[PDB]
Amino acid sequence: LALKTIDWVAFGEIIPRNQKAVANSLKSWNETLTSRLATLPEKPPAIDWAYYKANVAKAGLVDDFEKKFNALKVPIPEDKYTAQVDAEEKEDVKSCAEFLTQSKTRIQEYEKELEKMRNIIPFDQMTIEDLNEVFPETKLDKKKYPYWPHRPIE
Amino acid sequence: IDMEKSQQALVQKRHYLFDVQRNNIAMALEVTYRERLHRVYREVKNRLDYHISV
Amino acid sequence: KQVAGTMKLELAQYREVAAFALDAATQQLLSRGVRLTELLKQGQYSPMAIEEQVAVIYAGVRGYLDKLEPSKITKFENAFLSHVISQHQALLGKIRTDGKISEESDAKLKEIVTNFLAGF
């Protein structure tokens, strides 16, 4: 009785766009397996040693077959959640590192950006050079567009 | 800035998905075990019938 | 009866709407009848109590799935039925105890309705 959790409605919003459709297929197969597990019981149907015994001519045979079934063993499956666990942990590692690194770096960058945004030079107290640096796009192109005033006819 | 924050949040929360993958594997194994149980049950019942009916 | 008296009436209206072949009022009645038909029928050998009956009766009476494809309606209906049988099964017992339209049970209904709607 084990099943670990994803908010599937939201969980669809975690995968990179690589095969999120295949991810949806996996989730659907998961719901399918949930229904299937719901279907069958966990344990076997029982067996009647003495009941079927008195019921059958194979009476002591019924008891002995109950004993044999107690001896008889069906093969239990095998698990590989360890590989899944390693994949999950390594992915947590990689993704968290990349996020807390690049996102934080861009956070600092855009933080400086917001600071400078609050740091708008007054227009009259903004030199032509003030804007030219601030808006590098006004660059003279004074080689690509040298000819004073160094800009396109527009 | 908001975008970086949100991307961080989502990529972080993603691990519930790996939890669900573990769910899938665990359910597969549990169903295999339960089915083996029930199959043994049915085989035993068939054997028991094979004599009472005769 | 409360969950679906208007449902039966609206089925009748949709038939009165089905009596034609572009009022978005009529179009809405059409989608409503579409869901109603997609739901009402059932397969062979599916015993049950009035439980899921009153449930889907409010649900269609809610019509919050009228947007959902009436083709997808049957599938998502199986889905919602499974969801109710699993989680609100205790809440289902509560509604059984609700020998009246419990506004609490009704609220649980709308809530799990949105919940299964996400599961759709």
Swiss-Prot record, chain A:
Top-level taxon of origin: Eukaryota
UniProt keyword Transmembrane helix present: no
Post-translational modification N6-acetyllysine, affected residues: K27, K43, K58, K67, K73, K80, K90, K112, K139, K144
GO biological processes: proton motive force-driven ATP synthesis; proton motive force-driven mitochondrial ATP synthesis
Subcellular location: Mitochondrion; Mitochondrion inner membrane
Alphabetical keyword list: Acetylation, CF(0), Hydrogen ion transport, Ion transport, Membrane, Mitochondrion, Mitochondrion inner membrane, Transport
InterPro entries: ATP_synth_F0_dsu_mt (IPR008689), ATP_synth_F0_dsu_sf_mt (IPR036228)
N6-succinyllysine: residues carrying this PTM: K73, K80, K90, K139, K144
GO molecular function, one term: proton-transporting ATP synthase activity, rotational mechanism
Disulfide links within the chain: none
One Pfam family here: Mt_ATP-synt_D
Segments traversing the membrane: none
GO cellular component, one term: mitochondrial inner membrane
The keyword tRNA processing is assigned to this record: no
The family this protein is said to belong to: Belongs to the ATPase d subunit family.
Job of this protein: Subunit d, of the mitochondrial membrane ATP synthase complex (F(1)F(0) ATP synthase or Complex V) that produces ATP from ADP in the presence of a proton gradient across the membrane which is generated by electron transport complexes of the respiratory chain. ATP synthase complex consist of a soluble F(1) head domain - the catalytic core - and a membrane F(1) domain - the membrane proton channel. These two domains are linked by a central stalk rotating inside the F(1) region and a stationary peripheral stalk.
Quaternary structure (record): Component of the ATP synthase complex composed at least of ATP5F1A/subunit alpha, ATP5F1B/subunit beta, ATP5MC1/subunit c (homooctomer), MT-ATP6/subunit a, MT-ATP8/subunit 8, ATP5ME/subunit e, ATP5MF/subunit f, ATP5MG/subunit g, ATP5MK/subunit k, ATP5MJ/subunit j, ATP5F1C/subunit gamma, ATP5F1D/subunit delta, ATP5F1E/subunit epsilon, ATP5PF/subunit F6, ATP5PB/subunit b, ATP5PD/subunit d, ATP5PO/subunit OSCP.
Identification of the protein by name: ATP synthase peripheral stalk subunit d, mitochondrial
Chain's gene name: ATP5PD
UniProtKB/Swiss-Prot annotation, chain B:
Transmembrane segments: none
Highest taxon above the source species: Eukaryota
Modified residue annotations for N6-acetyllysine: K5, K13
Compartments in which it is found: Mitochondrion; Mitochondrion inner membrane
Function: Subunit b, of the mitochondrial membrane ATP synthase complex (F(1)F(0) ATP synthase or Complex V) that produces ATP from ADP in the presence of a proton gradient across the membrane which is generated by electron transport complexes of the respiratory chain. ATP synthase complex consist of a soluble F(1) head domain - the catalytic core - and a membrane F(1) domain - the membrane proton channel. These two domains are linked by a central stalk rotating inside the F(1) region and a stationary peripheral stalk.
Record family assignment: Belongs to the eukaryotic ATPase B chain family.
The protein's assembly and partners: Component of the ATP synthase complex composed at least of ATP5F1A/subunit alpha, ATP5F1B/subunit beta, ATP5MC1/subunit c (homooctomer), MT-ATP6/subunit a, MT-ATP8/subunit 8, ATP5ME/subunit e, ATP5MF/subunit f, ATP5MG/subunit g, ATP5MK/subunit k, ATP5MJ/subunit j, ATP5F1C/subunit gamma, ATP5F1D/subunit delta, ATP5F1E/subunit epsilon, ATP5PF/subunit F6, ATP5PB/subunit b, ATP5PD/subunit d, ATP5PO/subunit OSCP.
Protein name, entry field: ATP synthase peripheral stalk subunit b, mitochondrial
Species of the source: Bos taurus
From Swiss-Prot, chain C:
Domain of life: Eukaryota
The protein's assembly and partners: Homotrimer. Component of the ATP synthase complex composed at least of ATP5F1A/subunit alpha, ATP5F1B/subunit beta, ATP5MC1/subunit c (homooctomer), MT-ATP6/subunit a, MT-ATP8/subunit 8, ATP5ME/subunit e, ATP5MF/subunit f, ATP5MG/subunit g, ATP5MK/subunit k, ATP5MJ/subunit j, ATP5F1C/subunit gamma, ATP5F1D/subunit delta, ATP5F1E/subunit epsilon, ATP5PF/subunit F6, ATP5PB/subunit b, ATP5PD/subunit d, ATP5PO/subunit OSCP.
Modified residues (N6-acetyllysine): K1, K8, K67, K75, K100, K108, K110
Protein source organism: Bos taurus
Modified residues (N6-succinyllysine): K1, K67, K75, K100, K108
UniProt binding sites for ATP: Q42, Q44
Gene that produces this protein: ATP5F1A
Shown segment, full-protein numbering: 427 to 551 of 553
Post-translational modification note: Acetylated on lysine residues. BLOC1S1 is required for acetylation.
Function field: Subunit alpha, of the mitochondrial membrane ATP synthase complex (F(1)F(0) ATP synthase or Complex V) that produces ATP from ADP in the presence of a proton gradient across the membrane which is generated by electron transport complexes of the respiratory chain. ATP synthase complex consist of a soluble F(1) head domain - the catalytic core - and a membrane F(1) domain - the membrane proton channel. These two domains are linked by a central stalk rotating inside the F(1) region and a stationary peripheral stalk.
UniProt note on tissues of expression: Heart muscle (at protein level). Heart and liver.
Protein name as annotated: ATP synthase F(1) complex subunit alpha, mitochondrial
Family: Belongs to the ATPase alpha/beta chains family.
